[PDB]
Amino acid sequence: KILPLSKTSYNQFTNYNVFNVAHQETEAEAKLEESKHKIRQM
Amino acid sequence: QSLTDQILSVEQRYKEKQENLIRSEQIRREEVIYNAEQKLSRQMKLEE
């Protein structure tokens, strides 16, 4: 019976297998490097 | 009461075969996706 109400705190969803989390990517450079390479080549 | 304990034990065993199933499906979709991302690397052949 979860009624996750606290005016002083917020409860964490404490069911996350911490061992298999916090490693997505973004890596803009994954492709920008290629764009820029071509540009340098240009 | 023993049957209840059996029942719970076996239910946990049933989960195992089904964890194997979930991981089989979850891992597999990612495997396909990052086979698809090999073309990021073929598009790195492009760098070549």
Query: Is residue B44 a contact partner of residue A34, using CB atoms and an 8 Å limit?
Result: yes
Q: Tell me if A37 and B43 make a contact (CB, 8 A cut-off).
A: no
Q: In chain A, which residues have their Cβ closer than 8 Å to the Cβ of B43? A: 31, 34
* Among candidate residues A16, A12, A25, the one with its CA nearest the CA of residue B40: A25
Residue A18, classed as helix, strand or coil, is helix
Residues 6+ apart with CB under 8 A from A10: A4
Using CA of residue B18, residue B35, residue A20, residue A31, what is the dihedral sign?
negative
By the CB < 8 Å criterion, does A34 face chain B?
yes
DSSP state of A7: S
